[PDB]
Each structure stands twice: as C-alpha cells, then as structure tokens.
C-alpha cells in the first residue's frame, strides 16, 4: 500500500455575478481506516483555497449547514470589522451570510476559519479551515513556481487525536485550557503522511500551521535547505535560507525547496520546546509528507530580490498600548499537573532545566465545585479581563502607526499573539529583534515568558458591534478568555 497523494484544495475564483459560494457542513472522513464525523467548507474536511486579487472586490456567500452557530474569519486579510467574521459575525444554523471583500494588501497566503465565541478550538478541531491566495501586480512578474497542485502547493499541517470509536476526541477542560488541545496523529491537508509528486527544480510550499496548540518546526529529512520567500503578510525583500523553520499556530510561510531526480525526501517537523508537544511520536523528527521527484523540468524561479520592504519609522511620539497576558495561577498549575500526571516527565522534554523540575511535587489539587469565580472558562485574560464581547477594551487610531507591547511575563506558556485588521512589523519578538525571515509582514508574534513589541496600523473601520479581536492563537487560551475586542 503506497502513501496517499497529498490532497490539493481547489483554487476557487469568482463567478459572473462575482460570487464565491462556501458551504459549511458536517460529513465524514477516514483516518487509519476508522470513520470520524468531520466538518468542512465545500466538503467533508478543511476547505478550498479562495483566490483574491488586490484592488478587486468579491462577494462570498456563506451557507451554514451545521446545526450550531459559527462565524467565518479571514485570518491575515485587512478588511473592515463588519466583514472580519470575529465572534460577533454570527451565521445562524441553516442560514446564510454574504460579505464583500475589497482586497487592498500585497500578495500573500492567508487562511480562514471559524471564530465562534468560546468554541473556536472545537470548530477548528472538527475540520474547518480553508486558504486564501492573494495575488497582486507585482508577484506574477517574479515567475515563481505557480502551477497549483504541481510545483505550487499548500501544506496545512494539523494534529488530532481520536477516541477508540474513531471520532475526533476534542475537549476544552482544565488541562487543555492550560496547555492546549494536542494529539498524536499528524495530518497534512487532512491526510496521514501523503506523498507529493513534484517536477525537477523549485517546489513552492505554502506552509500553514493549522494546529490548535502545537508549534511546529519544519526541515527536510536530508538537510537540504528551505528558502523562505514569504511570511504571513507577503513576500520578504529577498529569500532567506534556513535549515529549519519554526512555525507558530496560525502562521504561514512560503518556502522554495530544490527537487532533484532520483532523490525522494521528506518534509519533517522537528521536536519543539513546548510543554506537552514532545510526546511520542513527536519526541523525534516526524514526517509531514514525502516529496517524490518527477523527471520533468519545473519552470519556476528563485529570484535574488522579491519585493521592497519599507524601513521601520521613528518610534518617538507613537501611541503605546499595553496588553498584559495572564493565566489564573491556580488553574495553570492544575492543568500542568494534570499533564504531568498523564504523560510524566516526557511532557516537559526539551524545556529548560529551571522549568523542567517535575520532582517531588504532586500535591492534592481539589476537585470540589467552588463556584463560577474558579471556573476555567474565564481563567485566561488580557489586562486582567477575560474576553467580554460586549466591551471593547479600547479604540485604536485609524491610519496611524501604534506600538503594541504584549507581555507573557508571569507564566511560561506559549502565546502566539494575533491582531485582526492588520499586517504588522515585529520590533521585538519575545525580547530579541526578529529573525530575518520574521522581520517582514506578520500577523502573529511569539510571546513566551517575555515581552514582544509590534508596529501596527489599521486602514479600516471596526465598530463596537463588529469589533476587531486581538488574542492568543493557542485556541484553548482564546476560548477561555485570552482575547480582547477593540474598535477603529
Ligand atoms: Cu486565525
Ligand atoms: Cu485573524
Ligand atoms: Cu496563550
Ligand atoms: Cu482571531
Ligand atoms: O483568529
């Protein structure tokens, strides 16, 4: 039995009425021979790739065929709050909502997913995610690999776990509210360890970490380099050669990799230094997909220069906004203890010696109900407040750079922090200047026991009724309060 081929999402463009139709629905998938209920856009699992063009408007008709409410957020796309599809963007079960997207940002790979209040983790875990391919005038002149599904492929990497009966085994509980929902099965565009046949020359991979909570670190099995050409918000100024590529939850990178005749190799993910994430099989490099070379010449180029990145402006005089992330200490400690009890020392493999200590310290954490004050559902916070959909925390300026300072000092958990309505520039990532491939346009920044600072500008309105979100993209943290709303 050979490896299945890598599924290729349909690249979906507008009709004559300038409409794209997305249906959200429940179906079935098979994983290792067992059927599971799964959810998808225009299918059973995952979704299509919606193709957009800078300066053109399209209308998307969104049909919710689930039996529960949902929303549809365009992660990475700079659009008004009204069409942003945050938690206020409710689509009733059996109903339809239409949005018009007036695309005005550079070429990039973005994505889309649910943003249902308190339930985003579950709805993503059930299968909802799709892709957005934005093109502009500039990018096509570069003559990059561009044959969709051949030498230009999306690679959506996600973990899941399943119960004995085959169903997706998702829970938002005290453990997952602390450390995230993660599993033992890695999916690549919904398939387990697929192969992709690619022509000789350059192969472009549009990588998305679509995991709820698991950070990833891409590399190749034979140590051939990856050439990073794009981050969340578009092209870098020039390619950046790397041996390994860390990718946080919700982040995208586009890379070129060389394909040579007769030498198959795997894309792999390397063990990460994140609590819970190095349990077998993830204690060792884990294959993501095999690349099978085809002896046909691939036409794409790796240009010396890709785009022009503007200089960072002067910081003096810019509004500063503080966003202090926090976790309830008691519930954080409880969740961590549950993780250690379940998996043992391995749940801290690869962490620092200071943190590591899982020594004599398994004291009795109580199991009685002490009321809503101690409910994990609102344990995670920004500026001392669990997300309140009725109360945006502030109004940001429109068309002005601001400096946002996001702190995770006070706990050791990983918080990939995401801000709607913008592509920003990272000034400091967790207390260090950003790596070259992370110095361009980003919509996510790492916050882990330290402080990050980003330079952000909002070009579109967001009223109180359809506010922008800023949140941790570890989805179980978001769902248990680590989110705020803001207006523009
Ligand atoms: Cu997102
Ligand atoms: Cu977003
Ligand atoms: Cu977090
Ligand atoms: Cu969001
Ligand atoms: O998001």
Curated annotation (Swiss-Prot):
Gene name linked to the record: cueO
Activity regulation (UniProt):
Ferroxidase and phenoloxidase activities are enhanced considerably in the presence of excess copper ions. A labile regulatory copper ion near the T1 copper site is important for the copper associated activation of enzyme activity. Ag(+) acts as a potent inhibitor of oxidase activity by binding at Cu(+) binding sites, blocking Cu(+) substrate binding and oxidation. pPD oxidase activity is strongly inhibited by sodium azide, an inhibitor of the electron transfer.
Q: What does this protein do?
A: Multicopper oxidase involved in copper homeostasis and copper tolerance under aerobic conditions. Is responsible for the oxidation of Cu(+) to the less harmful Cu(2+) in the periplasm, thereby preventing Cu(+) from entering the cytoplasm. Probably primarily functions as a cuprous oxidase in vivo. In vitro, in the presence of excess copper ions, exhibits ferroxidase and phenoloxidase activities. Fe(2+) is an excellent substrate in the presence of excess Cu(2+), but is inactive in the absence of Cu(2+). Oxidizes the phenolate iron siderophores enterobactin, 2,3-dihydroxybenzoate (2,3-DHB) and 3-hydroxyanthranilate (3-HAA). Oxidation and thus inactivation of enterobactin could protect cells from the interaction of enterobactin with copper and play a central role as an interface between copper detoxification and iron homeostasis.
Name the positions where Cu cation 2 binds. 75, 113, 473
> Deletion: any effect?
Disruption mutant is slightly more copper sensitive on complex medium than wild-type strain under aerobic conditions. Deletion of the gene does not affect copper sensitivity under anaerobic growth conditions. Deletion of the gene leads to elevated biosynthesis of enterobactin under conditions of iron scarcity when copper is present.
Task: State how the cofactor is bound.
Answer: Binds 4 Cu cations per monomer. Contains a mononuclear type 1 (T1) or 'blue' copper site, and a trinuclear copper center consisting of one type 2 (T2) or 'normal' copper site, and two type 3 (T3) or 'binuclear' copper sites.
Entry binding sites for Cu cation 1 = 73, 418
Question: Per its record, how is this protein called by name?
Answer: Multicopper oxidase CueO
Q: Which organism is it from?
A: Escherichia coli (strain K12)
């Amino acid at each position: 039995a050979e490896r299945p081929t890598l599924p290729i999402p349909d690249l979906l463009t507008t009709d004559a009425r300038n409409r794209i139709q997305l249906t959200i629905g429940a179906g079935q998938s098979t994983f290792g021979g067992k059927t599971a209920t799964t959810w998808g856009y225009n299918g059973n699992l995952l979704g299509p790739a919606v193709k957009l063009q800078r300066g053109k408007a399209v209308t998307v008709d969104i049909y919710n065929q689930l039996t529960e409410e949902t929303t549809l957020h365009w992660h990475g796309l700079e659009v008004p709050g009204e069409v942003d599809g945050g938690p206020q963007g409710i689509i009733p079960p059996g109903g339809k909502r239409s949005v018009t997207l007036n695309v005005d940002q550079p070429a990039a790979t973005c994505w889309f997913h649910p943003h249902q209040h308190g339930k985003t983790g579950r709805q993503v875990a059930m299968g909802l995610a799709g892709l957005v391919v934005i093109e502009d005038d500039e990018i096509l002149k570069l003559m990059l690999p561009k044959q969709w599904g051949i030498d230009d492929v999306p690679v959506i990497v996600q973990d899941k776990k399943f119960s004995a009966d085959g169903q997706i085994d998702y829970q938002l509980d005290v453990m997952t509210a602390a450390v995230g929902w993660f599993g033992d099965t890695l999916l690549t565009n919904g398939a387990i360890y697929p192969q992709h046949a690619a022509p000789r020359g350059w192969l472009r991979l549009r990588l998305l970490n679509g995991c709820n909570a698991r950070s990833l670190n891409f590399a190749t099995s034979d140590n051939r380099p990856l050439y990073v050409i794009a981050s969340d918000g578009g092209l870098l100024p020039e390619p950046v050669k790397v041996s390994e590529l860390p990718v946080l939850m919700g982040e995208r990178f586009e890379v070129l990799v060389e394909v040579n005749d007769n030498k198959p190799f795997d894309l792999v993910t390397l063990p990460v230094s994140q609590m819970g994430m190095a349990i077998a099989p993830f204690d060792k490099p884990h294959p993501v997909m095999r690349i099978q070379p085809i002896a046909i010449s691939a036409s794409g180029a790796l240009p010396d220069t890709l785009s022009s990145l503007p200089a960072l402006p002067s910081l003096e005089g810019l509004t500063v906004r503080k966003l202090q992330l926090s976790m309830d200490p008691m519930l954080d400690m409880m969740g961590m203890q549950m993780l250690m009890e379940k998996y043992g020392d391995q749940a801290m493999a690869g962490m620092d010696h200071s943190q590591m200590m899982g020594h004599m310290g398994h004291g009795n954490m109580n199991h009685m109900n002490h009321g809503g004050k101690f409910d994990f559902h609102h344990a995670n916070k920004i500026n001392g407040q669990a997300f309140d959909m009725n109360k945006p925390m502030f109004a940001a300026a429109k068309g002005q750079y601001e400096r946002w300072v996001i702190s995770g000092v006070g706990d050791m958990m990983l918080h990939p922090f995401h801000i709607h309505g913008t592509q920003f520039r990272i000034l400091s990532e967790n207390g260090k200047p950003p790596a070259a491939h992370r110095a361009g346009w980003k919509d996510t920044v790492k916050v882990e026991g330290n402080v990050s600072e980003v330079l952000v500008k909002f070009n579109h309105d967001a009223p109180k009724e359809h506010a922008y979100m800023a949140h941790c993209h570890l989805l179980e943290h978001e769902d248990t309060g680590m989110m705020l709303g803001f207006t523009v």
